[PDB]
């Protein structure tokens, strides 16, 4: 499972997710600090500036250092942030 | 990085207009606790209170922001003294309009009190009783002359009538109408409005008068 | 030829005038060759007045007005359509549209 | 430092000093003199977005939290001091001025008085920009 | 029957239509008392004909998608009337009323329309139509039915009944509860 | 910051607007306080009257 | 995509469980049986016919695609 | 409603936001102490009244009883058995939906001993059906005009009495529970239900509650009539043209405009406990003819479905009733007034003499 005794991320939890498969609006990315728990990204707010490209050789399987905006402990939806990130390198 | 709870350290000071205002207690200010570890008497008695007349008089107007230096804080009561009245922006730029002669008068005039005041004014023209001109002007000679009477009566009434009586003239513009009336043989002058009052000198010797201002 | 007769606005009775920037582009244009604009507008505009005037208590005082005199350069008057392309027969017209 | 005598039942006035500008909308209420502010909350305090700090929705978050802490601290009424940029500048407030005053009206802070606080020069000192500027 | 007309094997009565906006877009017993969901074989003759079609009949309509399954309502109404049976043996409730509750918790409240702001993505907090709220309810209900059956021992009726029951009371195991909330997420979101 | 859900019925459609003319301008009077009348937009096609479940009156949905 | 197999053997361990999971059973389709057990879904049908023959469960649907059973009359 | 006499001791104000914040959870249902009267079956073929085939409103020559607590003998018969607060359905609906009223209502709380006889004075402007109270603009025409607040309220009360007996199977046998109607073919086909509520703060509540109809599903009905007089002037939507894809929205376009009246119609069904709470779209024949009326649609709802829709909380509605009783049971004896201000949204307890 995970070595965290806690099950879920918290509010503004900077988490390391796993980019499994890219989906319609974004990608259902799964945490690995907490076990395998799915989170989501864009449409709303992950990017900050506009240069209009995403990948050249970046194939699959990435990891995103993202910050939990919303977490659904019952329903199972973890909204993630990088637009807020000035310091969370 | 650093926040505090300074609202365990502020004290409430009843901001007092003088008793020539029918509302004396204007309001209350949580001033940080004046003490040895935290001196705030300069941000207590150096407080200039910029308040409009509506909470000062009880309401002829709700413009005309008086500045109020607090000559003495007397036991959680900011017994203020007058500093400078205004005619604030919405009231001030309403009268400013094209196709009129904008007439102005800046004076720097000592009170009968120890206070040097500045008084800047504004004035405007009318479209008269039968006037078919779109605008309202005259010769520049009349423009200069109206300003001379406007400075004259303004220096006169503030040299007389010590500071609180300057406060007790100029809310319906006691200087105002006589500049219109004396010029009415030349130009009846639909506007005279003194707008920028700036206290140029402020000695504290009128603490008994501050008790005569208040109470 | 003169594509405009007054060339934005005339400078007759004046040999030379003072210039002005654009209020939204800071571009140097003369005073009587630019597009001026007065704005008399509430400070309490109709988005807030349905909630301000209800919470405006001890307030029998009327709604205040903001007084702004705008001055555009011609380049940012046209693309923003402060002024815009009219016909040359309409270009004779010295008429501002009403407010 | 709670309210003066009560935190509700009286209108002890605070003054708004709302510096509504572009790319932030400061809602920043002081004592009646001005020297002693309470609630240092910017429009981008709530949403540090660096393009939405003057936006209406973030200012509704900003003004109501100020409006919360005002009626928390016995200030139950506000003289509206809605400021533009002021000075020899653009002197125009941002979009977070209409909704935020509407928001604090919805929050519950009373308004007795409305007055304009924007400073304008007499055409004082020079402006940023050369002759061309951003050419359009 | 001339006193009250019911469903083919259930009752149009004892149906609890319990939303605020969705009155008279959800009706099975009010004017739409039908043993057999089929009006005339067309439902896009008018914009009015949407609210004319009940939700029990549009379900037989909005299922037959996916071109090999298009043009087959007789397979559908079979599987649809199969799916009501699979509701009641899991619930005990009126499976129409389960379906009627399934439109309720699957209908959104506020959604978002696209808008532009400084090149950045913002979306306007807007309501949708209670016509659309039904149409966003049914289409998300019709999506999880054929999909979950498509590589499973369960037929569409077993997946659709699980789709209705978990949307009759939002369990986030039906597709319609899970996708409504993402639509409603953007309204309180951007700008 | 936070406010409860307001049921404002449609009084009048104010138009179908947007880029494509599909964002339905609607006068949703508040339905609970008859003096409050707010104006919002609808994504979908609305014929009037129907009670729109406004989760907010903030973030004022206006012309586009 | 998907690769699943149930036990495609007639399984006593599933069927004795099926005889003993039967009060949890009220919606009894063979696919439910093939998922509550590891019986095939084909062989779920014949096992439920045996469980029908016990009279514990009762047919409520019989379609050529799939039958549905139901344990005793109302519950 | 009435002149505030100088011998009326004003007791305690109850503002409507004050009554909006009260709550009383865990209130027991009405235990039927006595069910007296006679209700006819419902003509289920009256569902064949719709947007292109209407039905003219039929005046039904029957005796209608809206009899107050101190004049209802069987409330006074059950005054000895159970209860300390005695009321009717029209009185408690006016009490529970007090906060939605704009026009004035008065209810005598005639405290006699350790009892609160919630009385209405006979022949007042209390049992009428006020029209467009909570609109943006109520009908501002003078009393001589048919478009006045009174002549429409007289019309709506004239409509609903004719309607609720028209929809009954008027010449088929009546569903009598235990007793006949204790206030007598001649009577209106109505049946009263006297029920018991413990109000938590220890008030055993007995109240008159009535069913309009029964309907063979047997389903109890409460049936009211919605008026349309001139919807161009009523500032609502015109009914007759579409009424169908909106259909609940044309219903919704009267809810804000008539907030107090229809929510009182909800409480009277909830006080009685009907099985289907029905309402009738009844419009005029022509818009300036306030006597000829036509039923447009007899629309059926459940009472819990209709209470779901419009605007209602019961913990508030019991909490308002917990508030008013605990004031009145603790004040003076004799007749009272809980009186609505005609122009202000609040109600006040008066202490009047028994001569009024």
GROMACS .gro file of N, CA, C and O in nm, chain E residues 3 15-20 23-25 29 48, chain H residues 44 50 245 247-248 251-252 301-302 305 308-309:
model
   96
  542UNK      N    1  -5.907   0.434  -1.513
  542UNK     CA    2  -5.884   0.512  -1.392
  542UNK      C    3  -5.739   0.559  -1.385
  542UNK      O    4  -5.711   0.679  -1.373
  554UNK      N    5  -4.464   0.733  -0.764
  554UNK     CA    6  -4.341   0.786  -0.819
  554UNK      C    7  -4.317   0.922  -0.757
  554UNK      O    8  -4.401   1.013  -0.769
  555UNK      N    9  -4.204   0.935  -0.689
  555UNK     CA   10  -4.168   1.054  -0.614
  555UNK      C   11  -4.078   1.142  -0.699
  555UNK      O   12  -3.957   1.118  -0.709
  556UNK      N   13  -4.139   1.242  -0.762
  556UNK     CA   14  -4.069   1.339  -0.843
  556UNK      C   15  -4.022   1.450  -0.750
  556UNK      O   16  -4.100   1.540  -0.715
  557UNK      N   17  -3.896   1.444  -0.707
  557UNK     CA   18  -3.848   1.526  -0.597
  557UNK      C   19  -3.729   1.614  -0.632
  557UNK      O   20  -3.629   1.613  -0.560
  558UNK      N   21  -3.736   1.690  -0.741
  558UNK     CA   22  -3.637   1.795  -0.765
  558UNK      C   23  -3.710   1.928  -0.770
  558UNK      O   24  -3.833   1.932  -0.782
  559UNK      N   25  -3.634   2.037  -0.764
  559UNK     CA   26  -3.690   2.172  -0.773
  559UNK      C   27  -3.714   2.216  -0.917
  559UNK      O   28  -3.827   2.255  -0.951
  562UNK      N   29  -3.951   1.971  -1.244
  562UNK     CA   30  -4.094   1.948  -1.256
  562UNK      C   31  -4.138   1.963  -1.400
  562UNK      O   32  -4.092   2.051  -1.474
  563UNK      N   33  -4.222   1.868  -1.443
  563UNK     CA   34  -4.284   1.859  -1.574
  563UNK      C   35  -4.184   1.842  -1.688
  563UNK      O   36  -4.221   1.856  -1.805
  564UNK      N   37  -4.058   1.812  -1.656
  564UNK     CA   38  -3.968   1.746  -1.748
  564UNK      C   39  -3.954   1.600  -1.708
  564UNK      O   40  -3.916   1.517  -1.792
  568UNK      N   41  -4.662   0.975  -1.461
  568UNK     CA   42  -4.799   0.949  -1.419
  568UNK      C   43  -4.887   1.071  -1.437
  568UNK      O   44  -5.009   1.064  -1.422
  587UNK      N   45  -4.038   2.140  -2.850
  587UNK     CA   46  -4.140   2.108  -2.751
  587UNK      C   47  -4.147   1.958  -2.725
  587UNK      O   48  -4.183   1.915  -2.615
  913UNK      N   49  -6.192   1.128  -1.142
  913UNK     CA   50  -6.061   1.113  -1.204
  913UNK      C   51  -6.062   1.145  -1.353
  913UNK      O   52  -5.954   1.161  -1.412
  919UNK      N   53  -5.735   2.050  -1.989
  919UNK     CA   54  -5.599   2.081  -2.031
  919UNK      C   55  -5.600   2.209  -2.115
  919UNK      O   56  -5.695   2.287  -2.111
 1114UNK      N   57  -4.449   2.271  -2.172
 1114UNK     CA   58  -4.307   2.241  -2.156
 1114UNK      C   59  -4.249   2.323  -2.042
 1114UNK      O   60  -4.146   2.287  -1.983
 1116UNK      N   61  -4.454   2.356  -1.789
 1116UNK     CA   62  -4.573   2.347  -1.704
 1116UNK      C   63  -4.555   2.373  -1.554
 1116UNK      O   64  -4.634   2.448  -1.495
 1117UNK      N   65  -4.452   2.317  -1.492
 1117UNK     CA   66  -4.414   2.357  -1.357
 1117UNK      C   67  -4.359   2.498  -1.345
 1117UNK      O   68  -4.349   2.551  -1.234
 1120UNK      N   69  -4.655   2.725  -1.308
 1120UNK     CA   70  -4.676   2.709  -1.165
 1120UNK      C   71  -4.575   2.792  -1.086
 1120UNK      O   72  -4.609   2.852  -0.983
 1121UNK      N   73  -4.450   2.797  -1.133
 1121UNK     CA   74  -4.346   2.869  -1.061
 1121UNK      C   75  -4.364   3.020  -1.073
 1121UNK      O   76  -4.318   3.096  -0.987
 1170UNK      N   77  -5.051   1.686  -0.744
 1170UNK     CA   78  -4.920   1.661  -0.684
 1170UNK      C   79  -4.940   1.585  -0.554
 1170UNK      O   80  -5.051   1.575  -0.502
 1171UNK      N   81  -4.830   1.530  -0.504
 1171UNK     CA   82  -4.830   1.477  -0.369
 1171UNK      C   83  -4.809   1.592  -0.271
 1171UNK      O   84  -4.753   1.696  -0.309
 1174UNK      N   85  -4.437   1.603  -0.214
 1174UNK     CA   86  -4.375   1.655  -0.336
 1174UNK      C   87  -4.399   1.804  -0.352
 1174UNK      O   88  -4.310   1.876  -0.399
 1177UNK      N   89  -4.193   1.986  -0.106
 1177UNK     CA   90  -4.055   1.984  -0.153
 1177UNK      C   91  -4.027   2.103  -0.244
 1177UNK      O   92  -3.921   2.166  -0.235
 1178UNK      N   93  -4.124   2.139  -0.328
 1178UNK     CA   94  -4.098   2.234  -0.436
 1178UNK      C   95  -4.083   2.377  -0.387
 1178UNK      O   96  -3.980   2.440  -0.415
   0.00000   0.00000   0.00000
